[PDB]
Design a protein around this motif. Structure first.
Motif, PDB file in Angstrom:
ATOM      1  N   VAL A   2      73.448 102.585 -17.970  1.00  0.00           N
ATOM      2  CA  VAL A   2      74.083 103.613 -17.161  1.00  0.00           C
ATOM      3  C   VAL A   2      74.326 104.813 -18.096  1.00  0.00           C
ATOM      4  O   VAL A   2      74.314 105.956 -17.658  1.00  0.00           O
ATOM      5  CB  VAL A   2      75.441 103.155 -16.569  1.00  0.00           C
ATOM      6  N   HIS A   3      74.521 104.550 -19.392  1.00  0.00           N
ATOM      7  CA  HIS A   3      74.732 105.627 -20.364  1.00  0.00           C
ATOM      8  C   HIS A   3      73.437 106.444 -20.514  1.00  0.00           C
ATOM      9  O   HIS A   3      73.468 107.670 -20.514  1.00  0.00           O
ATOM     10  CB  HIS A   3      75.122 105.065 -21.735  1.00  0.00           C
ATOM     11  N   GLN A   4      72.306 105.757 -20.651  1.00  0.00           N
ATOM     12  CA  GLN A   4      71.034 106.445 -20.800  1.00  0.00           C
ATOM     13  C   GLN A   4      70.687 107.178 -19.489  1.00  0.00           C
ATOM     14  O   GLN A   4      70.183 108.306 -19.506  1.00  0.00           O
ATOM     15  CB  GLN A   4      69.939 105.458 -21.194  1.00  0.00           C
ATOM     16  N   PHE A   6      72.699 108.596 -17.357  1.00  0.00           N
ATOM     17  CA  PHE A   6      73.399 109.872 -17.279  1.00  0.00           C
ATOM     18  C   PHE A   6      72.893 110.878 -18.311  1.00  0.00           C
ATOM     19  O   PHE A   6      72.883 112.087 -18.056  1.00  0.00           O
ATOM     20  CB  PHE A   6      74.916 109.680 -17.427  1.00  0.00           C
ATOM     21  N   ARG A   7      72.482 110.402 -19.480  1.00  0.00           N
ATOM     22  CA  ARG A   7      71.948 111.337 -20.466  1.00  0.00           C
ATOM     23  C   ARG A   7      70.626 111.927 -19.934  1.00  0.00           C
ATOM     24  O   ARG A   7      70.363 113.115 -20.093  1.00  0.00           O
ATOM     25  CB  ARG A   7      71.697 110.644 -21.817  1.00  0.00           C
ATOM     26  N   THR A  71      77.193  98.739  -9.199  1.00  0.00           N
ATOM     27  CA  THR A  71      77.762  99.067 -10.498  1.00  0.00           C
ATOM     28  C   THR A  71      79.112  99.743 -10.266  1.00  0.00           C
ATOM     29  O   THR A  71      79.264 100.506  -9.322  1.00  0.00           O
ATOM     30  CB  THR A  71      76.825 100.040 -11.266  1.00  0.00           C
ATOM     31  N   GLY A  73      81.647 102.450 -10.396  1.00  0.00           N
ATOM     32  CA  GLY A  73      81.469 103.876 -10.585  1.00  0.00           C
ATOM     33  C   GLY A  73      80.366 104.318  -9.624  1.00  0.00           C
ATOM     34  O   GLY A  73      79.872 105.440  -9.673  1.00  0.00           O
ATOM     35  N   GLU A  76      80.510 107.785  -7.925  1.00  0.00           N
ATOM     36  CA  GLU A  76      80.196 108.935  -8.764  1.00  0.00           C
ATOM     37  C   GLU A  76      78.689 108.988  -8.964  1.00  0.00           C
ATOM     38  O   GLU A  76      78.104 110.056  -9.007  1.00  0.00           O
ATOM     39  CB  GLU A  76      80.874 108.849 -10.134  1.00  0.00           C
TER      40      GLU A  76
ATOM     41  N   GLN C 110      70.969 103.554 -29.438  1.00  0.00           N
ATOM     42  CA  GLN C 110      71.516 103.769 -28.108  1.00  0.00           C
ATOM     43  C   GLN C 110      72.908 103.161 -28.109  1.00  0.00           C
ATOM     44  O   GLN C 110      73.851 103.758 -27.615  1.00  0.00           O
ATOM     45  CB  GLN C 110      70.663 103.099 -27.034  1.00  0.00           C
ATOM     46  N   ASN C 114      76.367 105.124 -27.528  1.00  0.00           N
ATOM     47  CA  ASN C 114      77.239 104.730 -26.418  1.00  0.00           C
ATOM     48  C   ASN C 114      78.647 104.414 -26.919  1.00  0.00           C
ATOM     49  O   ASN C 114      79.632 104.736 -26.260  1.00  0.00           O
ATOM     50  CB  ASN C 114      76.663 103.508 -25.684  1.00  0.00           C
ATOM     51  N   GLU C 117      80.293 107.625 -27.426  1.00  0.00           N
ATOM     52  CA  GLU C 117      80.692 108.273 -26.173  1.00  0.00           C
ATOM     53  C   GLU C 117      82.018 107.684 -25.648  1.00  0.00           C
ATOM     54  O   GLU C 117      82.917 108.423 -25.239  1.00  0.00           O
ATOM     55  CB  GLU C 117      79.591 108.124 -25.093  1.00  0.00           C
ATOM     56  N   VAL C 157      86.375 102.783 -14.631  1.00  0.00           N
ATOM     57  CA  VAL C 157      84.933 102.876 -14.843  1.00  0.00           C
ATOM     58  C   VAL C 157      84.608 102.683 -16.318  1.00  0.00           C
ATOM     59  O   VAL C 157      83.725 101.903 -16.669  1.00  0.00           O
ATOM     60  CB  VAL C 157      84.369 104.248 -14.365  1.00  0.00           C
ATOM     61  N   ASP C 160      84.585  99.139 -17.602  1.00  0.00           N
ATOM     62  CA  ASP C 160      83.364  98.428 -17.268  1.00  0.00           C
ATOM     63  C   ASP C 160      82.247  98.882 -18.199  1.00  0.00           C
ATOM     64  O   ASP C 160      81.474  98.066 -18.679  1.00  0.00           O
ATOM     65  CB  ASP C 160      82.963  98.681 -15.813  1.00  0.00           C
TER      66      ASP C 160
END
Lengths: 213, 213, 213
Positions: A2-4, A6-7, A71, A73, A76, C110, C114, C117, C157, C160
Motif C-alpha cells: 500500500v506504501h508503494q 501511494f508512492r 484493506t 483505509g 481513503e 522499500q 516505509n 514514512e 490506518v 495497520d
C-alpha cells in the motif's frame, strides 16, 4: 504494497499535472509550417501518454485489489483512486481537444497558404497582361496571340483551383466561426482578383485582334 | 486537396533527390573494417527508405484520386505523378545497386584480409624454421622435435586455409573482372610462400631427425 | 567461411567479456530511488542481451556447419565453440544473478523507506498530541475534539500499515537473512513508537474529555 501504491500514484499524478499544463497551450501556430511542427510535437506527447498508460493501469489494478481485500483505509484509497482516474480522464480529454484544435488550425493555415499561392500567380499575370506591347508587325501579333492563348489555358486551370479554395473556405466557416471575417474577406478578395484578371485579359485580347485585323 | 498534394510531392521529391545524391557515393572502403562500416551505414539508409514508403505511397494515392475525378489540370497532375514515380524507382534502383557493390567490396576485402592473415603466419614460421639450433643435450633435442611436431599439425591446417583462400579468389574472379590482376598475383604468391615454407620446414626437420638419431 | 568465423567469434567474445565485466558490479544502491535507477539500467542490459542473441547464434550455426563438413582443424573449431558457448552462458548467468540481487535490494530499501514514512508520521503526531492546550471556550474545546477524532481515525490506518511493514520485515528475514539485525531492530523500534503514541494519545484524549465534561 500500500506504501508503494501511494508512492506510484503520487508520482503519476505529478506527471499528469505537468502534462496537463503542456496540453493547455493555446498556441496553434502562425502559418502552415508552424502548425505542422506543432502537430508533430503534439503526436510525440500523445505517444508519451500512451507510454504511461501501463503504469497508470497498474495503479488502478493495485487499487482495486486493495479495495477488494478490504484493506484498512479502504475509503481513503477509493477516494484517491477516483480523484486519480479523474485527473487522467481530464488529461486525455484536454490532449484530444488540443489535437482537434490543431487539426482545425491546419485546415485554416492550408486555406491561408492556398489563397496566397493563387493571388501571387494572379498578381504576376496581371502585370504580364497589362503589357503595352500589341505587336509592331502582323507576324509579331500572331506570336502574342498564341502566347495569350497559352495563358488562358493556364488561367482556366487556376480558375478551377480558386473555386476549390473558396469551397474550402465556405466549409471552414460552416464547421464553426473561427476567423470568419478573415476567411470571408479573403474569398471575396480572391474572386475579385480573378474577375479583374478576366477583364484585363479580355481587353488585351481585343486589342491584339484589332491590331491584326 | 490539389494544393497540398503539390506541396507534399515537392517535399518528397527534394528528399528523394538528397538520398539519390548520397547513394551515388563511389566509396566502397579501403579495407575490411572500412567496408563493414559502410555496409552498416547502408543498411540504415535501406531501413529508412522502407520507413518512408507510406508517405510516398500516400502521395501516389492522392494523385490517383485527383486524376480519376478528372479534376481540371489533370494533365499536369499525371506528368508530375509520372516523374515522381520515376524519381522514386530511380532511387530504389541506385540504392540497391550500391548495396550490391558494397557486397562485392566486402568479399574482396575479406579475401585481402585472409591473404594477409595467412602470409603473416607463414612469415613468422619461416623465421622459426630457419633456426640452426638442433639441441645440445638429449633433453633439448626432443624438446625441439616436440615443438616441430606441433608446428606440422598447425601447418596442415594452414595449408587447407590457403587452399580455401585461393578457391575464394578464383570465385571472385569468376564473378567479375574486378581486381583480377591483384587477386591472381596474391594467390600465386601465397602458394609460393606455402611451397617455400614446406621446403624450409623439411630441411629443418631433417636436421633435427639427423641430430637425434 | 573459416577466417570470418574466427574473426566474428573473437569479436563476440570481446563484446561478451565487456558486458561480463559490467554485470560484475557490486553496487546495489543506497536507498529506494538508487535501487530503482539501477534496475532500469539493468533492464536495459537485459534487453541488449536479448537483441544480441541472433548474432551469437549465427556464429554457433557457422561453427556447426564447419564442424559437420569435416573442415580441417575441426578440433580447434570444436574447442573454441565450447569455450564461446560457456562464456555466453556465464554472462547470462551473471546477469540473472545481479538481477535477482537487485530485486532483493529493492524489497529491502522499500522496507527501509516505509519504516521512515511511518516513523516520520508518528514523530510529528507525537508533538501534536503532547500539546497541553485543552480548550478555552465551549467552541474551542469542541474544535480540539474534532481534530483529535480525525487523528484517531488516521492512527487506526497507520497502526495497520505499521503491522504490514513488520510482516514485510519478517518475510525479508525468512527469505534471505541479509540485514537481519537492522531489520529486527527497526521493527522493534517502530512497534515501540506506536505504543508510545498510543499512550500519549490516550493521555491527551483523557484531558480533552475531562475538560469538556
Amino acid at each position: 504494497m500500500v506504501h508503494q501504491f501511494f508512492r506510484d500514484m503520487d508520482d503519476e499524478e505529478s506527471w499528469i499535472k505537468e502534462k496537463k499544463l503542456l496540453v493547455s497551450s493555446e498556441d496553434y501556430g502562425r502559418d502552415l509550417t508552424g502548425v505542422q511542427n506543432l502537430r508533430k510535437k503534439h503526436k510525440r506527447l500523445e505517444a508519451e501518454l500512451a507510454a504511461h498508460e501501463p503504469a497508470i493501469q497498474s495503479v488502478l489494478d493495485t487499487g482495486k485489489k486493495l479495495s477488494d481485500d478490504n484493506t484498512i483505509g479502504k475509503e481513503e484509497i477509493q477516494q484517491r483512486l477516483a480523484q486519480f482516474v479523474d485527473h487522467w480522464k481530464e488529461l486525455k480529454q484536454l490532449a484530444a481537444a488540443r489535437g482537434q484544435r490543431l487539426e482545425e488550425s491546419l485546415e485554416y493555415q492550408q486555406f491561408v497558404a492556398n489563397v496566397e499561392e493563387e493571388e501571387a500567380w494572379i498578381n504576376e499575370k496581371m502585370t504580364l497582361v497589362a503589357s503595352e506591347d500589341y505587336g509592331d508587325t502582323l507576324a509579331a501579333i500572331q506570336g502574342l496571340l498564341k502566347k495569350h492563348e497559352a495563358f488562358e489555358t493556364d488561367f482556366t486551370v487556376h480558375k478551377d483551383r480558386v473555386n476549390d479554395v473558396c469551397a474550402n473556405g465556405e466549409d471552414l466557416i460552416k464547421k464553426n466561426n473561427h476567423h470568419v471575417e478573415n476567411i470571408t474577406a479573403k474569398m471575396k478578395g480572391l474572386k475579385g482578383k480573378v474577375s479583374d484578371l478576366e477583364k484585363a485579359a479580355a481587353q488585351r485580347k481585343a486589342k491584339l485582334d484589332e491590331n491584326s485585323a
